[PDB]
Amino acid sequence: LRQLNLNNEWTLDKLRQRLTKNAQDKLELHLFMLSGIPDTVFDLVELEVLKLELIPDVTIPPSIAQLTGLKELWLYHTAAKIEAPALAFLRENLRALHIKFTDIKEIPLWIYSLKTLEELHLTGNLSAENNRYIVIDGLRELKRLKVLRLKSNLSKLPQVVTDVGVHLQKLSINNEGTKLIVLNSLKKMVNLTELELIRCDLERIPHSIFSLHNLQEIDLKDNNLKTIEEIISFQHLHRLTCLKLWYNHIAYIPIQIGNLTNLERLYLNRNKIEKIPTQLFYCRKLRYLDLSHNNLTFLPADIGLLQNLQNLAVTANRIEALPPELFQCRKLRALHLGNNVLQSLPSRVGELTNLTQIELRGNRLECLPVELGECPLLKRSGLVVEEDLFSTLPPEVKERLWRADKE
Amino acid sequence: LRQLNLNNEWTLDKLRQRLTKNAQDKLELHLFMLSGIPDTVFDLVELEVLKLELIPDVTIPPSIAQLTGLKELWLYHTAAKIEAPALAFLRENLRALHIKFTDIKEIPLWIYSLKTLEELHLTGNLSAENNRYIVIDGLRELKRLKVLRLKSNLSKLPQVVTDVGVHLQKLSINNEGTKLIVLNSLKKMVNLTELELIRCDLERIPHSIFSLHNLQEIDLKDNNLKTIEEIISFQHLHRLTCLKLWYNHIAYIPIQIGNLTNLERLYLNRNKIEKIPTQLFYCRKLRYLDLSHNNLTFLPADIGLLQNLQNLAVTANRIEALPPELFQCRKLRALHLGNNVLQSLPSRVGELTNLTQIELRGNRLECLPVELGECPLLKRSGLVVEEDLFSTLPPEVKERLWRADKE
Numbered sequence: 077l078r079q080l081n082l083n084n085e086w087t088l089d090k091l092r093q094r095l096t097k098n099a100q101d102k103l104e105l106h107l108f109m110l111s112g113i114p115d116t117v118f119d120l121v122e123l124e125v126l127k128l129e130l131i132p133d134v135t136i137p138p139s140i141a142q143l144t145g146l147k148e149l150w151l152y153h154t155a156a157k158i159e160a161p162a163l164a165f166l167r168e169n170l171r172a173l174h175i176k177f178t179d180i181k182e183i184p185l186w187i188y189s190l191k192t193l194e195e196l197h198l199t200g201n202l203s204a205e206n207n208r209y210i211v212i213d214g215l216r217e218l219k220r221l222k223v224l225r226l227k228s229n230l231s232k233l234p235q236v237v238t239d240v241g242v243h244l245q246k247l248s249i250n251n252e253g254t255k256l257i258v259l260n261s262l263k264k265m266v267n268l269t270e271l272e273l274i275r276c277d278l279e280r281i282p283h284s285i286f287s288l289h290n291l292q293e294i295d296l297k298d299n300n301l302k303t304i305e306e307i308i309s310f311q312h313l314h315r316l317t318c319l320k321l322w323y324n325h326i327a328y329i330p331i332q333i334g335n336l337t338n339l340e341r342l343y344l345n346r347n348k349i350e351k352i353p354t355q356l357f358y359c360r361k362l363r364y365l366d367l368s369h370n371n372l373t374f375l376p377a378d379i380g381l382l383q384n385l386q387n388l389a390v391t392a393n394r395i396e397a398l399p400p401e402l403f404q405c406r407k408l409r410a411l412h413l414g415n416n417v418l419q420s421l422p423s424r425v426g427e428l429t430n431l432t433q434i435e436l437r438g439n440r441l442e443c444l445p446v447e448l449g450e451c452p453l454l455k456r457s458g459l460v461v462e463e464d465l466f467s468t469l470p471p472e473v474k475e476r477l478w479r480a481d482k483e
Numbered sequence: 484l485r486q487l488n489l490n491n492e493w494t495l496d497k498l499r500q501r502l503t504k505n506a507q508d509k510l511e512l513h514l515f516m517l518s519g520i521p522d523t524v525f526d527l528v529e530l531e532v533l534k535l536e537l538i539p540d541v542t543i544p545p546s547i548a549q550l551t552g553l554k555e556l557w558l559y560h561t562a563a564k565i566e567a568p569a570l571a572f573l574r575e576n577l578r579a580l581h582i583k584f585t586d587i588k589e590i591p592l593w594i595y596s597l598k599t600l601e602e603l604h605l606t607g608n609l610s611a612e613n614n615r616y617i618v619i620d621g622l623r624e625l626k627r628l629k630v631l632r633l634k635s636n637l638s639k640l641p642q643v644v645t646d647v648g649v650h651l652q653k654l655s656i657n658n659e660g661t662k663l664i665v666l667n668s669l670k671k672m673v674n675l676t677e678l679e680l681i682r683c684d685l686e687r688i689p690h691s692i693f694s695l696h697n698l699q700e701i702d703l704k705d706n707n708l709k710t711i712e713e714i715i716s717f718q719h720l721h722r723l724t725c726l727k728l729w730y731n732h733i734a735y736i737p738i739q740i741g742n743l744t745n746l747e748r749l750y751l752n753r754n755k756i757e758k759i760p761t762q763l764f765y766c767r768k769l770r771y772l773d774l775s776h777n778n779l780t781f782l783p784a785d786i787g788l789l790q791n792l793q794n795l796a797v798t799a800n801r802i803e804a805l806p807p808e809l810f811q812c813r814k815l816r817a818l819h820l821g822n823n824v825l826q827s828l829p830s831r832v833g834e835l836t837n838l839t840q841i842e843l844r845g846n847r848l849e850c851l852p853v854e855l856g857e858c859p860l861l862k863r864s865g866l867v868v869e870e871d872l873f874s875t876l877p878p879e880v881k882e883r884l885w886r887a888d889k890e
Contacts (some may be wrong), residue, residue: 108549129548130568153568178571200571253598253626325674348697417724440791464839467860 079112088116098125102148107131118142128154129176136162148172148195156184166190176200180211188214197225197248215240222246232257241265248272248295258284269293269315281306289313297322308332318364322346334358340384345370357381368392368412380404391415391435398422406430414438414460426450436461443468449477456481486519486540493521505532510552514538525550535561545569554578559606563591574599579630586611587618595621602630609635616641626650633657639664648672655679655702667691681705693719702727704750709733714740721745729753729773741765752776752796752819761785775799775819787811797823798842805832821845821867828852836860843868855880862887 091105091114098104102124105117109130117123118139126143129152136158140146149170158166163186172195177183182200187193202208215221215236222243227250237244238261245268249256255277262268262284270293271285278299285294286309294316301324310316318341326347334355336342341364350371357378362385369392377399379385385405392415403424411428414435421436426447431454436444444466448459456477459466469477498512498521505511511532512524520538524530525547532555535541541561545568547553553576560583565573570593579602584590586608594603609619620643622628629652633644636658645668648654654675656663663683669675669691678692679702686707692698693716701723708731717723718739726740729750734757740746741762752773764785774782775798782797787808796819803826809815810831816838822845833854838861851872855861856879863884873881 106549109546130545178568 079115082110082112082114083116086110086114086116088119091116091120095120100125103145104150115139121145124148125150125174128152128156130154131156133157135159138162141165146170148174150174150176151184152176153178153182155181158184158186163189168192172196180204180207183211188212188217191217192220193218194220195223196221197223197227199225199227201229203229203231209234209236212236219243226250227252229254230256233261235261238262238264242267244268246270246272246293248274249276250274251276253277258282260284260287263287266290271295272297274298283309286310286312289315291316293318295320295322296324298324300325302326303330304333305330307336310336314338317341317361319343320366329353329356331355337361340364341366343367345389347371352376354378360384363387365389369415370394375399375402377401383407386410388412400424403427411435421445423447429453431458433458433460436465438462441465446470446473449473452480454480455483489517489519490522493523495523495527498523498527499529502527502529509555511555520544522546528552531555533557535559537561542566543569545572548572548576555581557581558591559583560585560589561591562589563593565591565593570596573597578602580604581606583607587614590618595624598625599627601627602632603628604632605635607635610638616643619643622647629653631655634659636661637663640666640668642668645671649674651675653677655681656683657681658683660684665689665691670694673697676700678702688713696720696722698722699724700727701725703731704728705730707732710735711737711740714743718742724748726750733759735759736763738762744768747771747791749773752798759783764788767791770794772796773819782806782809784808790814793817793839795819796842797825799823803827805829807831817841823847830854838866841866841868844870848872851876851880853877853880856883858883859886859890862890864888 096104096106103122104125104127105123106127107113107117107129113128113131113134113136115137119142121142122145123143124145125148126146127150131154133155136156138161140162153176167189169192170190171192173187173190173193174197175183176199178200213236216239218240220243221240222245224244224246225248229252231254233256247270249272252275256273260283266288267290268288269290271291272295274295274297276299279301281296289312291313292315297320316336316338319339320341320343322343323346326349328351329349331353334357337359338361339359340361342362343366345366345368348371352372354376360381362382364387365385366387366389368389372393372395374396375390375398380401382405384407386407387410388408389410389412391412395416395418397419398421400422407430408428409430410433412435415438418439420441423445426445428451431451437460444461446469449469502510502512509531510529511534512530514524514535517538520535520541520543522544525544528549528551530550531552533553534557536559538561541563543563543565545566547569556577558581574597577597577600580594580600581604582594583606619641622643623646625647628647628650631651632655634657649672651674656679659682667690673695674697675695676697677700678698681702682705684707698720699722704727708728714737724745725748726746727750730753732755733751734755736759738760741764744766746766747768747770749769749772752775754777756777756779761783764783765788767789768791769789770791770793772792772794773796775796777800780801782802789812792812792814794817795815798819799822801824803824815832815835818841821842824847826847826849828848833852836858844867846869848869851868855868855876864887
């Protein structure tokens with residue numbers, strides 16, 4: 077009767093309008109604090125992200141076979157009991173199982189029969205008494221775990237994760253203020269492509285990062301770091317292409333930062349940096365230079381060397397003037413320059429054809445140069461500037477610009 | 484039963500009616516004098532600012548996890564008791580938090596367990612008896628707190644605040660008529676970017692500020708200085724961008740502040756200024772100034788050196804004409820000359836087309852010129868010129884001004 081009434085309150089026609097889309101453009105169904113998991117949910121045939129959040133003590137019925145598109149099973153805080161044919165369906169079919177949880181009963185005991193798993197994030201604290209990682213000792217059974225995002229506050233990297241690491245590639249360890257004592261356990265892990273020690277309170281970069289030769293994406297966010305002197309040992313890594321250094325307390329940069337020519341997305345933002353050396357521009361592959369909310373007094377001119385640079389974001393700095401050779405770059409896609417103390421934009425910004433979004437809300441612009449209307453791909457929406465400063469443009473020039481905006 | 488009744492009675496349509504927009508264009512819900520908190524409030528996902536004011540018997544249900552845009556929750560005079568899954572959701576979703584209370588009675592306990600928030604605004608008397616900064620001893624675990632406004636009529640700076648501040652960025656101090664005992668304890672805490680002091684009745688600016696080299700915005704409103712021999716000592720600090728000394732009693736401003744070209748904002752309105760010498764105005768790049776309701780007989784000549792203005796004021800004083808020195812300036816956008824005795828209006832001030840908002844109502848002008856007729860930029864909603872002589876102004880002038888009130 078509970079299941080029938082559950083289908084009655086939330087019919088297939090009722091949840092048909094409830095059908096929403098996620099970031100990955102997959103159909104999702106956010107089921108939240110619902111008394112049971114409904115069969116009208118299952119009558120759908122293209123749901124890919126079954127969003128099971130906080131559904132207490134419910135048996136998943138055989139009707140889940142109707143979800144032909146079900147790749148990602150998002151089990152959040154849900155006590156989920158399931159039958160034997162559907163266990164077999166899990167060992168042969170399911171490819172992604174994204175689990176948020178708090179309890180080892182909330183995480184289910186029937187996902188270690190699962191074998192076809194290829195993607196999973198765990199979210200929720202796992203430090204517990206007498207029951208640590210015997211939950212996921214079936215990671216050894218999970219022979220295809222490449223994506224393991226961990227917003228789970230692990231105090232130390234599991235060794236079963238290491239034995240998995242033959243195929244593990246992405247480890248986003250958001251420990252939330254807990255240090256990951258790697259103790260060169262990642263030295264055994266010679267096959268990683270990515271490592272993200274996010275908010276792990278390092279203050280010192282471990283050597284297990286440098287000792288590898290396959291890492292491509294390193295993200296050291298919010299580590300309270302002071303010096304980056306160790307990148308001379310980064311020349312062993314021949315595939316490093318991105319360093320997102322978000323939200324740190326770095327007082328100054330050395331010059332040897334110019335050595336990593338392989339770097340493309342070098343972030344150095346939200347820091348206390350007072351001097352950028354010219355040597356830094358020895359790198360040639362730099363593509364995403366996000367220097368937002370910094371203490372930079374001026375953009376260096378030698379930044380014109382970066383011919384691959386696409387998204388250069390230098391918002392909320394103390395940048396006074398823009399030098400000419402800064403505008404030697406033509407591949408710039410997103411120039412976020414707002415909240416600065418800039419007095420004017422040089423006319424070379426009119427040379428930019430790829431100009432799509434230029435943030436000029438702030439600065440000290442007396443009048444906008446007319447060449448800003450020359451940019452064809454730039455519409456009025458992309459022109460982020462104060463209206464009082466914007467209104468200097470000519471009438472028919474404004475007509476052409478509004479024609480571009482409405483097109 | 485009352486909580487349940489408030490749940491069903493508050494429909495989603497009436498609730499969508501109650502959603503307004505705040506300053507940040509963010510959707511705000513003002514929950515005013517509700518006996519409980521409707522679950523339909525948490526049903527509507529468009530909410531961002533949840534203002535719940537003087538709502539008793541509050542048990543915030545975790546259905547608020549289904550609400551998507553919640554970054555503000557405005558707890559006013561409320562004994563809040565949140566649930567643990569809601570604790571988990573707001574640890575990753577909420578980003579700002581204002582709290583109003585009456586001592587320990589309406590201070591909630593779940594606020595400390597949330598450790599990812601940015602803004603923690605506290606309202607109400609924290610200077611209670613027998614609890615001298617011992618309730619806030621649990622703030623040490625917060626490492627992500629960067630904005631902390633303290634308006635609780637504090638007697639002394641809490642030592643726990645000194646311990647916590649190491650990761651702070653924004654701090655505001657409001658005492659509303661109480662002499663704070665700072666006792667020069669700010670030398671420890673170096674990361675601070677914005678510091679404010681409003682109506683402290685000090686007259687003696689402390690010394691611990693100079694050990695900090697990161698303060699950009701300093702607000703000293705209503706501090707009633709009379710001889711600022713501190714701006715010769717403010718030369719030690721080379722980070723302050725805008726000084727805010729308005730509604731003071733400055734007899735004369737000492738000349739040394741003329742040496743800081745980075746100063747961009749001179750808020751000095753409603754003062755007891757008799758004469759202010761020249762060398763104050765050696766700084767060229769000052770945008771916003773306010774000098775309303777004074778006793779100045781002539782605006783000093785070296786304001787003519789100021790070439791980057793945006794706003795001034797000659798409200799309610801004994802100045803009859805605009806000097807040619809002010810005409811050496813070229814950037815007079817806004818002013819405040821209302822209810823004053825200005826007689827002569829030359830063509831130099833009148834040709835300033837970018838005149839943004841000048842108060843002129845009640846001014847004792849003789850006649851108003853026909854230069855307010857044609858141009859579509861300088862018009863009434865911009866310039867509120869004297870309406871006694873706006874009647875004798877030509878009807879085409881009135882056409883431009885009423886065009887302002889329409890366009």
